[PDB]
């Protein structure tokens, strides 16, 4: 009697089912988390494809001005999108069976809500699934944490921000141009560039790419001669071999002479931990930034912070970026606002 | 020999390696970095942009910068001994000589650092992939900080070395060039996000397929020619999770070299394009359709409107030398706002 | 003691940074 109860239950039908579900012999692993994931992602995918190709225009801002997002309605790959649900609906659950017809549903942006909810569910289940297979194969279980960062980002832009703003119409559009729109408006109303968490995110992705290129170049540089000339050096490695394929000492030495001796890593485990940690933390912080700005704790405001002796404002770059922000603000959703302050 | 003695001394194993490349690198690196600190602490941008730009004036780290030269200077190299400053250091700083200083010394600094990578690689006896990978960042600096302004009117429209200033350069390129719509930039984004993805996923995978080479829960201490992690287990895992996995370590490490570097190069192509205002600004089909049909709307057209707003309002403040006067009746805007 | 040196130095650094943060609320750049 310790921690795990090591015991079985004798070739029962339900036990056979549990065995097949949790089987590590399946080409694609289908854990319990997969019992959630597969149907959700399939529904989401089907509705997404069909809508991206043939869905009628959607009244996104509830002002009876439908926006066209599908290919068969004059869009291309870059401009096509699944338009977010109507602002008249807000955060109300709008399933197909709550509409009078599929046509109404399409008009108010039901597809977006459906796809977003199903996708978030299925992706959470995807995270859980990564853990699950790690456990079934006797691995360490922290890949799903790493993947928890992107899940957090998706959850931020598809769920939390609509919650803070009171409408799924503020959720990120499922499309390229729509994404850009989301970004611009977000900058106008939260000044995300001046938010330290977004700066942390940029550090995460720039730094991530940097360390990717760095590690890659270092290991590629110190590959051990196992191949002939003009032949692919990749052939000099075989899957499953125990011998290391590159000179780690030579790489550490190079890096040591590039900057200084104590700037380099000696422990590969430490190095790869760092490689995993930097971008994941960055993205974590940016996701938090998107959600907390979803509750209007915006980026740093230095508008007219510098004054002269007489009391006149001396502009800085923050004032210029504020000018651009103003442009986006006054220009976005031209027919949606009736009152001078944009509080929603 | 004389040259041989020079080489021997320069290539000595010090705490900080020097080399011939060091002869080029260290002065220029030092001067660029120092010029940035000097400028962001003391020098203003009142006579170039009409902006406070230093700690001395009340800027913080986010709003302080070494701003671009005055538009009237054109593409002048702005030497201290140039016909513009004529030796006068004060007038030199007031003109914006620190920007060209930082840019040129930074450029030659980058050359020197790449040459350093090549030199150390050759001395140690490694393949020069670090330098190539670094050709990436160089392409970014050359295209954005040199080529783009050289294509434009003057250095004035080049990025200013500062946080909020860089932010300004960003929103400027959005509002004026529709830079997000440019496919080359999209490839760049693919490169960076893909790079961060690869970094994270490789790190996590190696960390979570580790072999038990110790008794402590601290697996760091337990680390040889033997692989410290199970490549086969990793392959199995990602094959059953994602459908496809790496099988060749060499190909893997090359791949996470290749993705981000390529990203950078592509986006650079884009930026050259913008240097000549050769933009990916519009989709003529949708503009014509929208012109004839007032009920047709996409996120593309919405972003076009956004660009127009950006351009007006900021146009008046961001380009003071133009003396742009936009009466409040001509400024584009929606209802109420 | 090395640790005492690191502690004292750290406190000094944090004090200077704190003075900068205070400077964001006073004098130039304070919107006052």
């Amino acid at each position: 009697m310790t921690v795990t109860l090591e015991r079985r239950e004798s070739t029962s039908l339900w036990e056979r089912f549990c065995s097949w579900i949790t089987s590590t012999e399946n080409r694609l692993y289908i854990g319990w988390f997969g019992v959630l994931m597969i149907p959700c992602l399939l529904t989401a995918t089907t509705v997404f494809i069909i809508a991206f190709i043939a869905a009628p225009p959607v009244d996104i801002d509830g002002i009876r001005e439908p926006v066209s997002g599908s290919l068969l309605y004059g869009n291309n790959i870059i401009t096509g999108a699944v338009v977010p649900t109507s602002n008249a609906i807000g955060l109300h659950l709008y399933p197909i069976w709550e509409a009078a017809s599929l046509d109404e549903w399409l008009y108010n942006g039901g597809p977006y809500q459906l796809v977003v909810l199903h996708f978030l569910l299925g992706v959470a289940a995807y995270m859980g699934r990564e853990w699950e297979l790690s456990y079934r194969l006797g691995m360490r279980p922290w890949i799903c944490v790493a993947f928890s960062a992107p899940v957090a980002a998706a959850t931020a832009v598809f769920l939390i921000y609509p919650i803070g703003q009171g409408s799924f119409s503020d959720g990120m559009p499922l499309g390229i141009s729509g994404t850009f729109n989301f970004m611009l408006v977000f900058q106008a109303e939260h000044n995300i560039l001046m938010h330290p968490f977004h700066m942390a995110g940029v550090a995460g992705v720039f730094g991530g790419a940097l360390f990717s290129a760095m590690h890659g170049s270092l290991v590629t540089s110190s590959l051990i001669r196992e191949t002939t000339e003009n032949e692919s050096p990749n052939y000099g490695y075989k899957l499953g071999q125990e011998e290391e394929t590159y000179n780690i000492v030579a790489a550490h030495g190079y890096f040591g002479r590039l900057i200084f001796q104590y700037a380099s890593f000696n422990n590969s485990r430490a190095l790869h931990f760092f490689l995993g940690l930097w971008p994941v933390v960055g993205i974590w912080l940016t996701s938090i930034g998107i959600s907390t700005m979803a509750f209007n704790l915006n980026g740093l405001n230095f508008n007219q912070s510098i004054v002269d002796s007489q009391g006149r404002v001396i502009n800085t770059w923050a004032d210029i970026i504020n000018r651009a922000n103003l442009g986006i603000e006054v220009m976005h959703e031209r027919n949606a606002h009736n009152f001078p302050l944009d509080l929603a | 020999g004389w040259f041989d003695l020079l080489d021997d001394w320069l290539k000595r194993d010090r705490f900080v390696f020097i080399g011939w490349s060091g002869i080029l690198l260290f002065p220029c690196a030092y001067l660029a970095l120092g010029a940035w600190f000097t400028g962001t602490t003391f020098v203003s941008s009142w006579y170039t942009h009409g902006l406070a730009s230093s700690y001395l004036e009340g800027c913080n780290f986010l709003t302080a910068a070494v701003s671009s030269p005055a538009n009237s200077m054109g593409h002048s190299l702005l030497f201290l001994w140039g016909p513009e400053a004529q030796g006068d250091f004060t007038r030199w700083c007031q003109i914006g000589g620190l920007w060209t200083f930082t840019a040129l010394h930074g450029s030659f600094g980058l050359i020197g650092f790449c040459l350093r990578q090549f030199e150390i690689a050759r001395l140690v006896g490694l393949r020069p992939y670090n330098a190539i990978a670094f050709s990436g960042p160089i392409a970014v600096f050359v295209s954005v900080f040199l080529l783009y302004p050289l294509g434009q009117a003057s250095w004035f429209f080049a990025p200013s070395f500062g946080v909020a200033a860089i932010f300004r350069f960003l929103l400027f390129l959005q509002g004026f060039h529709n830079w997000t719509l440019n496919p080359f930039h999209m490839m760049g984004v693919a490169g960076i996000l893909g790079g961060a993805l690869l970094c994270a996923i490789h790190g996590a995978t190696v960390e979570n397929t580790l072999f038990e080479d110790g008794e402590a829960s601290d697996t760091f201490r337990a680390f040889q020619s033997e692989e410290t992690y199970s490549m086969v287990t990793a392959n199995r895992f990602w094959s059953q999770i994602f459908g496809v996995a790496f099988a060749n370590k060499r190909w893997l490490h090359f791949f996470l070299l290749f993705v981000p570097v390529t990203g950078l190069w592509v986006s650079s192509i884009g930026i050259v394009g913008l240097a000549l205002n050769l933009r990916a600004y519009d989709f003529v089909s949708q503009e014509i359709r929208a012109a004839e049909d007032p009920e047709f709307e996409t996120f593309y057209t919405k972003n076009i409107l956004l660009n127009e707003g950006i351009r007006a309002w900021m146009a008046a403040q961001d380009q003071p030398h133009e003396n742009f006067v936009f009466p409040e009746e001509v400024l584009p805007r929606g209802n109420a706002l | 003691p090395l640790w005492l040196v690191v502690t004292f130095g750290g406190i000094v650094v944090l004090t200077v940074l704190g003075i900068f943060i205070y400077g964001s609320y006073s004098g130039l750049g304070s919107s006052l």
């Binding site: 004054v307 002269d308 002796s309 | 010090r14 705490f15 900080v16 020097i18 030092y30 120092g34 600190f37 602490t41 003391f42 700690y55 001395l56 | 200077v16 003075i19 900068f20 205070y22 400077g23 006073s26 004098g27 130039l28 006052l32």
Partner: peptide
């Protein structure tokens, strides 16, 4: 080169730190 580099970075750093503090007390 150790002395030259370490001092090359450290000396101006202290100079600048003093300067910026002094700036913290400059009134309008």
């Amino acid at each position: 080169f150790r002395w030259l580099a370490i001092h090359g970075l450290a000396i101006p750093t202290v100079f600048f730190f003093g300067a910026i503090t002094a700036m913290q007390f400059i009134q309008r």
